[PDB]
Structure 1
Amino acid sequence: IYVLDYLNETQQLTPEIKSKAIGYLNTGYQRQLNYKHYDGSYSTFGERYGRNQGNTWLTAFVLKTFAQARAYIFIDEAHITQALIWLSQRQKDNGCFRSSGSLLNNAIKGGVEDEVTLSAYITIALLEIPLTVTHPVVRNALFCLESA
C-alpha cells in the first residue's frame, strides 16, 4: 500500500503494476478473510471456529492497510465497521488497551510491546482512520497518553 503510495506520491507511476498489485491486494484481502471472526476481528488462525479471539496490534495493522488501500480503490464498509465495534468494547473507562494476544512470533512486531505503545498505536491508528479526533473513546486513549 505504502510502496504504491510512495510511487504515486512521487509520480513514479505505471498502470499494469497496479494490475499486478490488484491481484496482490485482492488475494491478500481475502486471505485476511481466511482468519477473522464473524464478530469481525483478526488473529493468527481464525476462521472455521470460535475457539480464539482477535488482536489489538495486528487488527490495527490490518485496518491501517484497510484504510489506505481503501483510500485508492473500492472497499465495502460494514466489516471494518464491526471491527470498530470490537475495538470500541475493548478498553477501560479510564485506563488503556489490552494486548489480548493470540499472535504468531516474537519479532514480527518491530515494537517491543510496551502497554504504553500498545494502547497508543491502537488509538492513533484508529485516528489514522477517516474518523474524528473527538470521540470519547480516543479521549480515554488521550487520558492513557498523558498517563503514559
Structure 2
Amino acid sequence: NLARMAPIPYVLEYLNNTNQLTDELLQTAVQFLNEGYYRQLRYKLPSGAYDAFWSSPSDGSSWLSAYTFKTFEKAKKYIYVDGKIQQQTLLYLQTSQKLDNGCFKAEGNLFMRQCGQERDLCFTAYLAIALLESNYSSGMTLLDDALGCLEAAMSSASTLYFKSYTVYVFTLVQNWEIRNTLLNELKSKVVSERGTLHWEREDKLGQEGIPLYYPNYSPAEVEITAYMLLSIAKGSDPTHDDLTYMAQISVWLIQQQNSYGGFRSTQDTVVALQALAFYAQLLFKSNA
C-alpha cells in the first residue's frame, strides 16, 4: 500500500522547490495523499503497531510500523495525520526494546528475508534512518542506542546490503570520518559498465546461472544504488569530479525504468524516485 504514498511528498517538495509547483497538481496530490491515508489506517493494530494482511493479523510487524511512521511523519505536512497514532507508534517502538546484546530485535519474519542473520542489525539501521528522516534530533534514547549499535559494526557485518544502510545513516548524521571511510571502502566494490556504475548484490552463495539466478534485473541492487546516490549527493560539497559520478550512477538507475514509473517493486521504486528527485534538485535548466 505504501507505494502510492512514499514518493508523493518527495516529488511534491521537488516540484515546489524547483519553481514547478502547480495549484491543481498540488490539489490532486493532496487528494491521493488522503486516499492512501484512508487505506493505510485500516491495517493498524490496537497495540499501535502496523502489520500487513489485516484479514490475517500476526502480532504486528516492527519494520512495517517503522515504515508507516516514516511515511506519516513525512506526509503530515499537507494532509491531516492523527498525532496520537504517531505517539502510540513511537511508544510501541520504545517498548520494543528486545536488546540482543547492543542490538535491537525486529518483530515479524516476513520482510527482511534476504539479509540473513543480519536481520536485527538491518532493522536497527532502518529504524535509525527513519528517526533521522523524521525531523528528529540525536537527543533521544532510541537514536543514541541505534548510533551506539551502528558504531560497533565496522569489523563485523560484511554484507553490502547492511553497508548501504550504514552508509545512509552515517551520511544522515553529519560526519567527516566514519561516513567518508565507509563510502571510500564501498566505492572500491562498484560494478562498472559502458557509462554506468552500480552495486551488485554480491550474493556469493550460489553464484550460478541455471538454478533461478539468470535474471539480471535483480530489484535488490537498485535500492543499494539509490542509497549510494543519495548518500554521496548529501555531502558537504560535491566537487566537479563528483558530478560525473552522479551522472554515471543516475543513468544506470534510470535505465531500469518501466513504461509506468514503477521500476521493479514497491520497496525499491520509492528509494529510486526519492534519489532521482534529490539528484534533479541539484541540476535545473531555466529554459531547457
Alignment of 1:27-106 (within 5 A): 27-46=35-54, 51-91=57-97, 92=99, 95-101=102-108, 103=110
Q: Tell me the equivalent position of 1:4.
A: 12
Q: Tell me the equivalent position of 1:22.
A: 30
Tell me how far 1:31 sits from its aligned partner.
0.9
**Partners of 1:77 and 1:25 in 2: CA distance:** 16
Tell me how far 1:13 sits from its aligned partner.
1.0
Tell me how far 1:104 sits from its aligned partner.
6.5
**Partners of 1:96 and 1:104 in 2: CA distance:** 18
Question: Does the C-alpha gap of structure 1 residues 124 and 26 become closer, same or farther in structure 2, counting only changes over 3 Å?
Answer: same
Tell me how far 1:26 sits from its aligned partner.
0.9
**Partners of 1:103 and 1:15 in 2: CA distance:** 40
Q: Tell me the equivalent position of 2:167.
A: none
**Structure 2 contact 63–107 (Cα < 8 Å) conserved:** no
Secondary structure, aligned partner of 2:48: coil
1:144 counterpart = 2:149: yes
1:117 counterpart = 2:125: no
Tell me how far 1:27 sits from its aligned partner.
1.3
CA offset digits 1:27-67 (Å, max 9, x no partner): 111211111111212111237x8x52222322222122211
Unaligned runs of 5+ in 1: none
**Partners of 1:104 and 1:98 in 2: CA distance:** 13
**Structure 1 contact 94–140 (Cα < 8 Å) conserved:** no
Structure with greater contact order relative to length (CA < 8 Å, sep ≥ 6): 1
Tell me how far 1:105 sits from its aligned partner.
9.4
The farther-off stretch of 32-41 and 67-76 is: 67-76
Q: TM-score, normalised by structure 1?
A: 0.80
Tell me how far 1:116 sits from its aligned partner.
2.6
**Partners of 1:144 and 1:17 in 2: CA distance:** 42
Give me the identity figure in percent: 42
RMSD of aligned C-alpha atoms?
A: 2.5
Q: TM-score, normalised by structure 2?
A: 0.44
Question: Does the C-alpha gap of structure 1 residues 37 and 105 become closer, same or farther in structure 2, counting only changes over 3 Å?
Answer: same
**Partners of 1:125 and 1:105 in 2: CA distance:** 16
Which has the larger Rg? 2
Tell me how far 1:4 sits from its aligned partner.
1.0
Q: What is the count of residue pairs matched by the alignment?
A: 142
**Partners of 2:112 and 2:141 in 1: CA distance:** 33
The farther-off stretch of 79-88 and 7-16 is: 7-16
